[PDB]
Each structure stands twice: as C-alpha cells, then as structure tokens.
Write a protein that binds this DNA or RNA. Sequence first.
DNA 1: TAACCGCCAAGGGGATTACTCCCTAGTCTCCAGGCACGTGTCAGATATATACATCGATAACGGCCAGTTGTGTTTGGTGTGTTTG
Length: 48
Amino acid sequence: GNWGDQKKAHQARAGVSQVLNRLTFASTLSHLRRLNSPIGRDGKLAKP
DNA sequence: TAACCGCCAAGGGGATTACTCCCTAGTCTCCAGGCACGTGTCAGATATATACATCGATAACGGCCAGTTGTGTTTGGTGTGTTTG
C-alpha cells in the first residue's frame, strides 16, 4: 500500500491500496466506490 | 667169417645232337610312391586400440565475509536606543 519506492516507502502515502472487505455484498460495493482525502489524520481544523 | 679179388652179365643212364618254343633284356611311354611346395586353418606372439583405474590440474559447486498538520513555549544573536565613564 505504500504508494512509492521500497527504499523511501515511509516518505510516500499509506493505505492507497487496501484489502477488499468481502464481509457482505454491500460492504464490497461500498469499498469499491470509496474515497479518501490526503489531509493528515486527526487534524485540528474542522473545515475539511 | 666176410673183406677182398677175380671172372662174368644185363642194361641203366650220362653225354651229345638237331631242332624248336617262347623267354626275357631292352625301349619309349606313363603310373605309384614320396618328399617338397601351396593354400588354408587354428593357435600363439606382437602390436594397435578401447576401456577402467590412479593420480594430477582446472574449476564447478559450497559457503563466508565484505561493501552496498498544527499550537504553544523556550533560547540566542543583531540592530537601535539611552546612559555612563
């Protein structure tokens, strides 16, 4: 899932590729059609 | 008493003869034997060749070591300013 080179993996993004959650058809669909913002996790701001 | 000598006798058979048969020494030819080669075969010796074995060298294979987003504070120095000596 590290969208970058192996040597500098930590410098690249994380979670870009995830394991498809095959727990129930609805979950599969939701997963295949999901988004994710690059903003840092748990940011103090609340506009985004 | 019979070996020997003497007179007597018949005729056997040894030597010779004319003549005849066919024998055998001899010749050219050509077989049987025998000792020499000729081709062939088996056995052996010398030689070339393939194969397995010991030993030596390279070097493939094993394995090690080497380098290859944000908030809230502090401190510490520079420039300006005022007063002092």
